[PDB]
Amino acid sequence: AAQTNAPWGLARISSTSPGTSTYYYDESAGQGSCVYVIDTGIEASHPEFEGRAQMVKTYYYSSRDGNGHGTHCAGTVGSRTYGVAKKTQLFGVKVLDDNGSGQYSTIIAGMDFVASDKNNRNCPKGVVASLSLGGGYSSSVNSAAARLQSSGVMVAVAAGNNNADARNYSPASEPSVCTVGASDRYDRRSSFSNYGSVLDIFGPGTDILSTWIGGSTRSISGTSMATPHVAGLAAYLMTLGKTTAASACRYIADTANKGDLSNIPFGTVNLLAYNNYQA
């Protein structure tokens, strides 16, 4: 399949070269997979989700995305226009309030929710969790992400937007999950993107067009936005049978575009997420 005039991030994950605008992907498009968006919630009624998005858990008075952050990341995972896996099932877990903030215990409880809730969902092709959040280091948050990964969920997390080593951030510094850095349309590391040895992969993170609350769209930057590219890619790849949740991060890294990113610090992987789709 070919989506013309796609957001640059979609076009990049299906391209060996930057500067193109058509997203190429197998038409299976992640069907039969599920991606949990652990964020501010999802505006499921957005036409872009086509009834494939639904809120499954909130820790606040409402499950509505009063922020737009989780709607934006869910859109990058699997919206029809801005999504990687255009047929995946999206499950919203609102661990962040509408200010984009949330206590670590709530984030931990939301991660433990997904590890159990996936047994309440129909995801024959596999389960992904997209964690577009983070703060200071926390062994408890890391262990929560490790448990979610161990339960059989491909956990993709943002490296963080501190232009620092991600070792000092959670769940970015959890070794067993997929820590995602951000790159821009010119294959530069995003100026804000964290780095370091814990990073597993880079994804499109600068000026990412996706869904927004109120049925709108907008373009925002962040490793928070590169993460759903890798999460959607993981669901896409698991639907294709090319990898499983336990090995998707390693697989994505094995099949990534190598040495194509600039301003990658010495010791950080120079790997850009790539769906390796050939028509």
PDB file of all heavy atoms in Angstrom, residues 36-42 54-66 91-98 101 106-107 109-110 113-114 117 121, unseen atoms left out:
ATOM      1  N   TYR A  36      -1.539  -0.195  23.258  1.00  0.00           N
ATOM      2  CA  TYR A  36      -1.966   0.613  24.388  1.00  0.00           C
ATOM      3  C   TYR A  36      -1.228   1.940  24.357  1.00  0.00           C
ATOM      4  O   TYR A  36       0.006   1.968  24.336  1.00  0.00           O
ATOM      5  CB  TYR A  36      -1.686  -0.108  25.701  1.00  0.00           C
ATOM      6  CG  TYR A  36      -2.635  -1.236  26.008  1.00  0.00           C
ATOM      7  CD1 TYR A  36      -2.460  -2.494  25.444  1.00  0.00           C
ATOM      8  CD2 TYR A  36      -3.697  -1.050  26.882  1.00  0.00           C
ATOM      9  CE1 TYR A  36      -3.324  -3.530  25.740  1.00  0.00           C
ATOM     10  CE2 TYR A  36      -4.561  -2.078  27.184  1.00  0.00           C
ATOM     11  CZ  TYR A  36      -4.372  -3.314  26.613  1.00  0.00           C
ATOM     12  OH  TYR A  36      -5.238  -4.332  26.915  1.00  0.00           O
ATOM     13  N   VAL A  37      -1.972   3.034  24.367  1.00  0.00           N
ATOM     14  CA  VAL A  37      -1.392   4.366  24.444  1.00  0.00           C
ATOM     15  C   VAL A  37      -1.549   4.823  25.888  1.00  0.00           C
ATOM     16  O   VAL A  37      -2.631   5.230  26.314  1.00  0.00           O
ATOM     17  CB  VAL A  37      -2.041   5.332  23.455  1.00  0.00           C
ATOM     18  CG1 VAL A  37      -1.435   6.721  23.606  1.00  0.00           C
ATOM     19  CG2 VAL A  37      -1.850   4.820  22.039  1.00  0.00           C
ATOM     20  N   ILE A  38      -0.461   4.731  26.648  1.00  0.00           N
ATOM     21  CA  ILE A  38      -0.445   5.127  28.049  1.00  0.00           C
ATOM     22  C   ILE A  38      -0.033   6.596  28.083  1.00  0.00           C
ATOM     23  O   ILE A  38       1.141   6.931  27.922  1.00  0.00           O
ATOM     24  CB  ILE A  38       0.493   4.243  28.870  1.00  0.00           C
ATOM     25  CG1 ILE A  38       0.217   2.768  28.563  1.00  0.00           C
ATOM     26  CG2 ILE A  38       0.306   4.499  30.347  1.00  0.00           C
ATOM     27  CD1 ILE A  38       1.055   1.807  29.375  1.00  0.00           C
ATOM     28  N   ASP A  39      -1.008   7.480  28.298  1.00  0.00           N
ATOM     29  CA  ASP A  39      -0.793   8.901  28.064  1.00  0.00           C
ATOM     30  C   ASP A  39      -1.863   9.738  28.759  1.00  0.00           C
ATOM     31  O   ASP A  39      -2.189   9.493  29.924  1.00  0.00           O
ATOM     32  CB  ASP A  39      -0.780   9.167  26.555  1.00  0.00           C
ATOM     33  CG  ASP A  39       0.033  10.393  26.175  1.00  0.00           C
ATOM     34  OD1 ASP A  39      -0.246  11.485  26.710  1.00  0.00           O
ATOM     35  OD2 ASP A  39       0.946  10.262  25.332  1.00  0.00           O
ATOM     36  N   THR A  40      -2.423  10.721  28.054  1.00  0.00           N
ATOM     37  CA  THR A  40      -3.496  11.551  28.589  1.00  0.00           C
ATOM     38  C   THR A  40      -4.875  11.067  28.167  1.00  0.00           C
ATOM     39  O   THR A  40      -5.871  11.735  28.458  1.00  0.00           O
ATOM     40  CB  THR A  40      -3.320  13.009  28.153  1.00  0.00           C
ATOM     41  OG1 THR A  40      -3.405  13.096  26.726  1.00  0.00           O
ATOM     42  CG2 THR A  40      -1.983  13.557  28.610  1.00  0.00           C
ATOM     43  N   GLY A  41      -4.958   9.933  27.492  1.00  0.00           N
ATOM     44  CA  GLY A  41      -6.208   9.443  26.951  1.00  0.00           C
ATOM     45  C   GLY A  41      -6.248   9.604  25.443  1.00  0.00           C
ATOM     46  O   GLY A  41      -5.331  10.133  24.816  1.00  0.00           O
ATOM     47  N   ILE A  42      -7.338   9.118  24.861  1.00  0.00           N
ATOM     48  CA  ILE A  42      -7.543   9.164  23.420  1.00  0.00           C
ATOM     49  C   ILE A  42      -8.933   9.714  23.159  1.00  0.00           C
ATOM     50  O   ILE A  42      -9.905   9.263  23.776  1.00  0.00           O
ATOM     51  CB  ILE A  42      -7.402   7.775  22.770  1.00  0.00           C
ATOM     52  CG1 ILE A  42      -6.104   7.086  23.189  1.00  0.00           C
ATOM     53  CG2 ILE A  42      -7.487   7.880  21.252  1.00  0.00           C
ATOM     54  CD1 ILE A  42      -5.935   5.713  22.548  1.00  0.00           C
ATOM     55  N   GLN A  54     -10.378   3.227  21.700  1.00  0.00           N
ATOM     56  CA  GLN A  54     -11.310   3.188  22.815  1.00  0.00           C
ATOM     57  C   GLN A  54     -10.526   3.382  24.099  1.00  0.00           C
ATOM     58  O   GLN A  54      -9.392   2.911  24.220  1.00  0.00           O
ATOM     59  CB  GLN A  54     -12.087   1.867  22.858  1.00  0.00           C
ATOM     60  CG  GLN A  54     -11.211   0.645  23.079  1.00  0.00           C
ATOM     61  CD  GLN A  54     -12.016  -0.624  23.273  1.00  0.00           C
ATOM     62  OE1 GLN A  54     -12.219  -1.081  24.399  1.00  0.00           O
ATOM     63  NE2 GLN A  54     -12.477  -1.204  22.171  1.00  0.00           N
ATOM     64  N   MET A  55     -11.133   4.087  25.046  1.00  0.00           N
ATOM     65  CA  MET A  55     -10.558   4.217  26.372  1.00  0.00           C
ATOM     66  C   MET A  55     -10.874   2.970  27.180  1.00  0.00           C
ATOM     67  O   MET A  55     -12.031   2.540  27.252  1.00  0.00           O
ATOM     68  CB  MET A  55     -11.098   5.462  27.068  1.00  0.00           C
ATOM     69  CG  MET A  55     -10.636   6.755  26.432  1.00  0.00           C
ATOM     70  SD  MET A  55      -8.833   6.869  26.381  1.00  0.00           S
ATOM     71  CE  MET A  55      -8.435   6.752  28.120  1.00  0.00           C
ATOM     72  N   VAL A  56      -9.846   2.381  27.778  1.00  0.00           N
ATOM     73  CA  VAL A  56     -10.027   1.188  28.590  1.00  0.00           C
ATOM     74  C   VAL A  56      -9.765   1.441  30.067  1.00  0.00           C
ATOM     75  O   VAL A  56     -10.184   0.620  30.900  1.00  0.00           O
ATOM     76  CB  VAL A  56      -9.148   0.026  28.079  1.00  0.00           C
ATOM     77  CG1 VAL A  56      -9.514  -0.306  26.641  1.00  0.00           C
ATOM     78  CG2 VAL A  56      -7.669   0.376  28.187  1.00  0.00           C
ATOM     79  N   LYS A  57      -9.110   2.542  30.425  1.00  0.00           N
ATOM     80  CA  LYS A  57      -8.770   2.780  31.818  1.00  0.00           C
ATOM     81  C   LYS A  57      -8.417   4.244  32.016  1.00  0.00           C
ATOM     82  O   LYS A  57      -7.696   4.833  31.208  1.00  0.00           O
ATOM     83  CB  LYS A  57      -7.596   1.898  32.263  1.00  0.00           C
ATOM     84  CG  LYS A  57      -7.202   2.072  33.723  1.00  0.00           C
ATOM     85  CD  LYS A  57      -8.278   1.537  34.662  1.00  0.00           C
ATOM     86  CE  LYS A  57      -7.812   1.594  36.108  1.00  0.00           C
ATOM     87  NZ  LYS A  57      -8.924   1.331  37.065  1.00  0.00           N
ATOM     88  N   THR A  58      -8.927   4.817  33.097  1.00  0.00           N
ATOM     89  CA  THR A  58      -8.482   6.120  33.549  1.00  0.00           C
ATOM     90  C   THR A  58      -8.306   6.063  35.053  1.00  0.00           C
ATOM     91  O   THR A  58      -8.903   5.226  35.736  1.00  0.00           O
ATOM     92  CB  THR A  58      -9.465   7.244  33.164  1.00  0.00           C
ATOM     93  OG1 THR A  58      -8.990   8.495  33.682  1.00  0.00           O
ATOM     94  CG2 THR A  58     -10.855   6.967  33.721  1.00  0.00           C
ATOM     95  N   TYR A  59      -7.452   6.946  35.561  1.00  0.00           N
ATOM     96  CA  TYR A  59      -7.274   7.127  36.993  1.00  0.00           C
ATOM     97  C   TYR A  59      -7.750   8.501  37.437  1.00  0.00           C
ATOM     98  O   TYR A  59      -7.430   8.945  38.542  1.00  0.00           O
ATOM     99  CB  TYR A  59      -5.813   6.897  37.369  1.00  0.00           C
ATOM    100  CG  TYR A  59      -5.345   5.500  37.035  1.00  0.00           C
ATOM    101  CD1 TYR A  59      -4.851   5.193  35.771  1.00  0.00           C
ATOM    102  CD2 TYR A  59      -5.417   4.480  37.976  1.00  0.00           C
ATOM    103  CE1 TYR A  59      -4.434   3.915  35.460  1.00  0.00           C
ATOM    104  CE2 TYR A  59      -5.001   3.200  37.672  1.00  0.00           C
ATOM    105  CZ  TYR A  59      -4.512   2.922  36.415  1.00  0.00           C
ATOM    106  OH  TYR A  59      -4.098   1.646  36.115  1.00  0.00           O
ATOM    107  N   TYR A  60      -8.521   9.174  36.587  1.00  0.00           N
ATOM    108  CA  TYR A  60      -8.997  10.530  36.810  1.00  0.00           C
ATOM    109  C   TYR A  60     -10.511  10.543  36.653  1.00  0.00           C
ATOM    110  O   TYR A  60     -11.132   9.517  36.362  1.00  0.00           O
ATOM    111  CB  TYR A  60      -8.303  11.505  35.848  1.00  0.00           C
ATOM    112  CG  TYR A  60      -6.797  11.428  35.963  1.00  0.00           C
ATOM    113  CD1 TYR A  60      -6.074  10.491  35.239  1.00  0.00           C
ATOM    114  CD2 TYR A  60      -6.105  12.261  36.833  1.00  0.00           C
ATOM    115  CE1 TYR A  60      -4.703  10.400  35.361  1.00  0.00           C
ATOM    116  CE2 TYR A  60      -4.731  12.179  36.959  1.00  0.00           C
ATOM    117  CZ  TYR A  60      -4.036  11.244  36.221  1.00  0.00           C
ATOM    118  OH  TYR A  60      -2.669  11.155  36.335  1.00  0.00           O
ATOM    119  N   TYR A  61     -11.115  11.717  36.860  1.00  0.00           N
ATOM    120  CA  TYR A  61     -12.572  11.805  36.846  1.00  0.00           C
ATOM    121  C   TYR A  61     -13.156  11.483  35.480  1.00  0.00           C
ATOM    122  O   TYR A  61     -14.328  11.099  35.394  1.00  0.00           O
ATOM    123  CB  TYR A  61     -13.018  13.197  37.290  1.00  0.00           C
ATOM    124  CG  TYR A  61     -12.340  14.323  36.546  1.00  0.00           C
ATOM    125  CD1 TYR A  61     -12.817  14.758  35.315  1.00  0.00           C
ATOM    126  CD2 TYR A  61     -11.222  14.955  37.078  1.00  0.00           C
ATOM    127  CE1 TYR A  61     -12.197  15.786  34.632  1.00  0.00           C
ATOM    128  CE2 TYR A  61     -10.599  15.988  36.404  1.00  0.00           C
ATOM    129  CZ  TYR A  61     -11.088  16.397  35.180  1.00  0.00           C
ATOM    130  OH  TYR A  61     -10.470  17.425  34.506  1.00  0.00           O
ATOM    131  N   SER A  62     -12.370  11.630  34.420  1.00  0.00           N
ATOM    132  CA  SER A  62     -12.812  11.357  33.064  1.00  0.00           C
ATOM    133  C   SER A  62     -11.734  10.572  32.340  1.00  0.00           C
ATOM    134  O   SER A  62     -10.552  10.645  32.683  1.00  0.00           O
ATOM    135  CB  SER A  62     -13.113  12.651  32.296  1.00  0.00           C
ATOM    136  OG  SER A  62     -13.421  12.383  30.940  1.00  0.00           O
ATOM    137  N   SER A  63     -12.157   9.811  31.336  1.00  0.00           N
ATOM    138  CA  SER A  63     -11.226   9.161  30.428  1.00  0.00           C
ATOM    139  C   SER A  63     -10.969   9.988  29.176  1.00  0.00           C
ATOM    140  O   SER A  63     -10.088   9.632  28.386  1.00  0.00           O
ATOM    141  CB  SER A  63     -11.749   7.776  30.035  1.00  0.00           C
ATOM    142  OG  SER A  63     -12.905   7.887  29.226  1.00  0.00           O
ATOM    143  N   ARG A  64     -11.711  11.078  28.989  1.00  0.00           N
ATOM    144  CA  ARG A  64     -11.504  11.947  27.841  1.00  0.00           C
ATOM    145  C   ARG A  64     -10.099  12.532  27.854  1.00  0.00           C
ATOM    146  O   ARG A  64      -9.531  12.815  28.913  1.00  0.00           O
ATOM    147  CB  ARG A  64     -12.532  13.081  27.835  1.00  0.00           C
ATOM    148  CG  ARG A  64     -13.936  12.664  27.414  1.00  0.00           C
ATOM    149  CD  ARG A  64     -14.793  13.882  27.082  1.00  0.00           C
ATOM    150  N   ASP A  65      -9.538  12.710  26.663  1.00  0.00           N
ATOM    151  CA  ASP A  65      -8.250  13.381  26.518  1.00  0.00           C
ATOM    152  C   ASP A  65      -8.508  14.881  26.527  1.00  0.00           C
ATOM    153  O   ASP A  65      -8.837  15.486  25.507  1.00  0.00           O
ATOM    154  CB  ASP A  65      -7.549  12.935  25.242  1.00  0.00           C
ATOM    155  CG  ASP A  65      -6.153  13.522  25.101  1.00  0.00           C
ATOM    156  OD1 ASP A  65      -5.619  14.069  26.087  1.00  0.00           O
ATOM    157  OD2 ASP A  65      -5.584  13.425  23.998  1.00  0.00           O
ATOM    158  N   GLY A  66      -8.383  15.491  27.699  1.00  0.00           N
ATOM    159  CA  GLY A  66      -8.501  16.932  27.763  1.00  0.00           C
ATOM    160  C   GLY A  66      -7.238  17.675  27.410  1.00  0.00           C
ATOM    161  O   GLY A  66      -7.199  18.906  27.479  1.00  0.00           O
ATOM    162  N   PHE A  91      -5.897   1.237  22.473  1.00  0.00           N
ATOM    163  CA  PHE A  91      -6.474   1.206  23.808  1.00  0.00           C
ATOM    164  C   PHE A  91      -5.866   2.340  24.614  1.00  0.00           C
ATOM    165  O   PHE A  91      -4.650   2.370  24.829  1.00  0.00           O
ATOM    166  CB  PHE A  91      -6.218  -0.139  24.485  1.00  0.00           C
ATOM    167  CG  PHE A  91      -6.884  -1.288  23.799  1.00  0.00           C
ATOM    168  CD1 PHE A  91      -6.176  -2.436  23.493  1.00  0.00           C
ATOM    169  CD2 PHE A  91      -8.220  -1.217  23.448  1.00  0.00           C
ATOM    170  CE1 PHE A  91      -6.792  -3.493  22.858  1.00  0.00           C
ATOM    171  CE2 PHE A  91      -8.839  -2.271  22.816  1.00  0.00           C
ATOM    172  CZ  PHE A  91      -8.126  -3.409  22.520  1.00  0.00           C
ATOM    173  N   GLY A  92      -6.708   3.274  25.051  1.00  0.00           N
ATOM    174  CA  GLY A  92      -6.244   4.394  25.840  1.00  0.00           C
ATOM    175  C   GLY A  92      -6.195   4.060  27.316  1.00  0.00           C
ATOM    176  O   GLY A  92      -7.159   3.533  27.877  1.00  0.00           O
ATOM    177  N   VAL A  93      -5.064   4.370  27.940  1.00  0.00           N
ATOM    178  CA  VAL A  93      -4.894   4.275  29.385  1.00  0.00           C
ATOM    179  C   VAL A  93      -4.495   5.662  29.871  1.00  0.00           C
ATOM    180  O   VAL A  93      -3.366   6.109  29.634  1.00  0.00           O
ATOM    181  CB  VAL A  93      -3.845   3.227  29.775  1.00  0.00           C
ATOM    182  CG1 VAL A  93      -3.674   3.196  31.290  1.00  0.00           C
ATOM    183  CG2 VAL A  93      -4.254   1.856  29.248  1.00  0.00           C
ATOM    184  N   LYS A  94      -5.416   6.347  30.546  1.00  0.00           N
ATOM    185  CA  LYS A  94      -5.188   7.727  30.970  1.00  0.00           C
ATOM    186  C   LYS A  94      -4.499   7.719  32.326  1.00  0.00           C
ATOM    187  O   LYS A  94      -5.140   7.703  33.377  1.00  0.00           O
ATOM    188  CB  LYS A  94      -6.494   8.508  31.008  1.00  0.00           C
ATOM    189  CG  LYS A  94      -6.310   9.958  31.426  1.00  0.00           C
ATOM    190  CD  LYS A  94      -7.534  10.792  31.114  1.00  0.00           C
ATOM    191  CE  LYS A  94      -7.319  12.250  31.497  1.00  0.00           C
ATOM    192  NZ  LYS A  94      -6.180  12.867  30.758  1.00  0.00           N
ATOM    193  N   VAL A  95      -3.169   7.730  32.301  1.00  0.00           N
ATOM    194  CA  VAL A  95      -2.394   7.883  33.524  1.00  0.00           C
ATOM    195  C   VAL A  95      -1.991   9.331  33.764  1.00  0.00           C
ATOM    196  O   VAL A  95      -1.604   9.673  34.891  1.00  0.00           O
ATOM    197  CB  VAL A  95      -1.143   6.984  33.516  1.00  0.00           C
ATOM    198  CG1 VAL A  95      -1.544   5.534  33.358  1.00  0.00           C
ATOM    199  CG2 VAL A  95      -0.178   7.419  32.413  1.00  0.00           C
ATOM    200  N   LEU A  96      -2.077  10.187  32.753  1.00  0.00           N
ATOM    201  CA  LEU A  96      -1.754  11.598  32.892  1.00  0.00           C
ATOM    202  C   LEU A  96      -3.035  12.413  32.940  1.00  0.00           C
ATOM    203  O   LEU A  96      -3.982  12.139  32.197  1.00  0.00           O
ATOM    204  CB  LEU A  96      -0.880  12.074  31.729  1.00  0.00           C
ATOM    205  CG  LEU A  96       0.415  11.302  31.480  1.00  0.00           C
ATOM    206  CD1 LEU A  96       1.203  11.934  30.339  1.00  0.00           C
ATOM    207  CD2 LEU A  96       1.251  11.252  32.749  1.00  0.00           C
ATOM    208  N   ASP A  97      -3.063  13.423  33.810  1.00  0.00           N
ATOM    209  CA  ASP A  97      -4.190  14.340  33.821  1.00  0.00           C
ATOM    210  C   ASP A  97      -4.172  15.191  32.551  1.00  0.00           C
ATOM    211  O   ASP A  97      -3.310  15.043  31.679  1.00  0.00           O
ATOM    212  CB  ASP A  97      -4.176  15.207  35.083  1.00  0.00           C
ATOM    213  CG  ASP A  97      -2.916  16.054  35.219  1.00  0.00           C
ATOM    214  OD1 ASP A  97      -2.137  16.175  34.250  1.00  0.00           O
ATOM    215  OD2 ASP A  97      -2.710  16.617  36.313  1.00  0.00           O
ATOM    216  N   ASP A  98      -5.129  16.111  32.447  1.00  0.00           N
ATOM    217  CA  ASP A  98      -5.197  16.936  31.247  1.00  0.00           C
ATOM    218  C   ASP A  98      -4.112  18.005  31.201  1.00  0.00           C
ATOM    219  O   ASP A  98      -3.993  18.695  30.184  1.00  0.00           O
ATOM    220  CB  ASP A  98      -6.585  17.561  31.127  1.00  0.00           C
ATOM    221  CG  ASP A  98      -7.668  16.516  30.908  1.00  0.00           C
ATOM    222  OD1 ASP A  98      -7.328  15.393  30.482  1.00  0.00           O
ATOM    223  OD2 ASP A  98      -8.856  16.815  31.147  1.00  0.00           O
ATOM    224  N   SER A 101       0.385  15.710  33.224  1.00  0.00           N
ATOM    225  CA  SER A 101       1.124  15.298  34.404  1.00  0.00           C
ATOM    226  C   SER A 101       0.461  14.096  35.060  1.00  0.00           C
ATOM    227  O   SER A 101      -0.740  13.855  34.909  1.00  0.00           O
ATOM    228  CB  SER A 101       1.228  16.451  35.409  1.00  0.00           C
ATOM    229  OG  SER A 101       1.294  15.964  36.738  1.00  0.00           O
ATOM    230  N   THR A 106       0.601   6.211  39.696  1.00  0.00           N
ATOM    231  CA  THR A 106      -0.457   6.059  38.702  1.00  0.00           C
ATOM    232  C   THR A 106       0.095   5.505  37.395  1.00  0.00           C
ATOM    233  O   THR A 106      -0.524   4.634  36.773  1.00  0.00           O
ATOM    234  CB  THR A 106      -1.148   7.401  38.470  1.00  0.00           C
ATOM    235  OG1 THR A 106      -1.771   7.835  39.685  1.00  0.00           O
ATOM    236  CG2 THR A 106      -2.205   7.285  37.381  1.00  0.00           C
ATOM    237  N   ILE A 107       1.257   6.002  36.961  1.00  0.00           N
ATOM    238  CA  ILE A 107       1.886   5.471  35.755  1.00  0.00           C
ATOM    239  C   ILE A 107       2.243   4.005  35.948  1.00  0.00           C
ATOM    240  O   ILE A 107       2.036   3.177  35.056  1.00  0.00           O
ATOM    241  CB  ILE A 107       3.118   6.314  35.379  1.00  0.00           C
ATOM    242  CG1 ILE A 107       2.692   7.742  35.025  1.00  0.00           C
ATOM    243  CG2 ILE A 107       3.867   5.675  34.220  1.00  0.00           C
ATOM    244  CD1 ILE A 107       3.838   8.733  34.956  1.00  0.00           C
ATOM    245  N   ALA A 109       0.742   1.925  38.045  1.00  0.00           N
ATOM    246  CA  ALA A 109      -0.506   1.171  38.086  1.00  0.00           C
ATOM    247  C   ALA A 109      -1.097   1.017  36.692  1.00  0.00           C
ATOM    248  O   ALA A 109      -1.688  -0.021  36.372  1.00  0.00           O
ATOM    249  CB  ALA A 109      -1.504   1.850  39.024  1.00  0.00           C
ATOM    250  N   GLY A 110      -0.936   2.037  35.847  1.00  0.00           N
ATOM    251  CA  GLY A 110      -1.396   1.928  34.473  1.00  0.00           C
ATOM    252  C   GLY A 110      -0.585   0.936  33.662  1.00  0.00           C
ATOM    253  O   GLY A 110      -1.127   0.235  32.804  1.00  0.00           O
ATOM    254  N   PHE A 113      -1.767  -2.350  34.761  1.00  0.00           N
ATOM    255  CA  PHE A 113      -3.082  -2.577  34.166  1.00  0.00           C
ATOM    256  C   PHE A 113      -2.954  -3.213  32.791  1.00  0.00           C
ATOM    257  O   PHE A 113      -3.626  -4.206  32.489  1.00  0.00           O
ATOM    258  CB  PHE A 113      -3.858  -1.262  34.070  1.00  0.00           C
ATOM    259  CG  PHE A 113      -5.134  -1.373  33.284  1.00  0.00           C
ATOM    260  CD1 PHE A 113      -6.300  -1.804  33.893  1.00  0.00           C
ATOM    261  CD2 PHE A 113      -5.165  -1.058  31.935  1.00  0.00           C
ATOM    262  CE1 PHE A 113      -7.478  -1.916  33.172  1.00  0.00           C
ATOM    263  CE2 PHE A 113      -6.335  -1.171  31.207  1.00  0.00           C
ATOM    264  CZ  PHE A 113      -7.495  -1.600  31.829  1.00  0.00           C
ATOM    265  N   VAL A 114      -2.093  -2.646  31.939  1.00  0.00           N
ATOM    266  CA  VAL A 114      -1.951  -3.144  30.573  1.00  0.00           C
ATOM    267  C   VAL A 114      -1.496  -4.594  30.577  1.00  0.00           C
ATOM    268  O   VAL A 114      -2.008  -5.423  29.815  1.00  0.00           O
ATOM    269  CB  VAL A 114      -0.975  -2.255  29.778  1.00  0.00           C
ATOM    270  CG1 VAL A 114      -0.732  -2.843  28.401  1.00  0.00           C
ATOM    271  CG2 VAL A 114      -1.505  -0.840  29.672  1.00  0.00           C
ATOM    272  N   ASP A 117      -4.633  -6.285  31.418  1.00  0.00           N
ATOM    273  CA  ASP A 117      -5.774  -6.014  30.553  1.00  0.00           C
ATOM    274  C   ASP A 117      -5.611  -6.639  29.174  1.00  0.00           C
ATOM    275  O   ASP A 117      -6.612  -6.930  28.510  1.00  0.00           O
ATOM    276  CB  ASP A 117      -5.999  -4.509  30.422  1.00  0.00           C
ATOM    277  CG  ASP A 117      -7.257  -4.181  29.641  1.00  0.00           C
ATOM    278  OD1 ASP A 117      -8.357  -4.269  30.227  1.00  0.00           O
ATOM    279  OD2 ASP A 117      -7.146  -3.850  28.440  1.00  0.00           O
ATOM    280  N   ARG A 121      -8.347  -8.524  26.034  1.00  0.00           N
ATOM    281  CA  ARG A 121      -8.462  -7.987  24.692  1.00  0.00           C
ATOM    282  C   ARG A 121      -8.130  -9.068  23.678  1.00  0.00           C
ATOM    283  O   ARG A 121      -7.490 -10.076  23.991  1.00  0.00           O
ATOM    284  CB  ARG A 121      -7.531  -6.789  24.485  1.00  0.00           C
ATOM    285  CG  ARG A 121      -7.636  -5.738  25.561  1.00  0.00           C
ATOM    286  CD  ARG A 121      -9.009  -5.100  25.591  1.00  0.00           C
ATOM    287  NE  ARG A 121      -9.236  -4.399  26.849  1.00  0.00           N
ATOM    288  CZ  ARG A 121     -10.381  -3.816  27.182  1.00  0.00           C
ATOM    289  NH1 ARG A 121     -11.412  -3.841  26.348  1.00  0.00           N
ATOM    290  NH2 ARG A 121     -10.496  -3.209  28.354  1.00  0.00           N
TER     291      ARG A 121
END
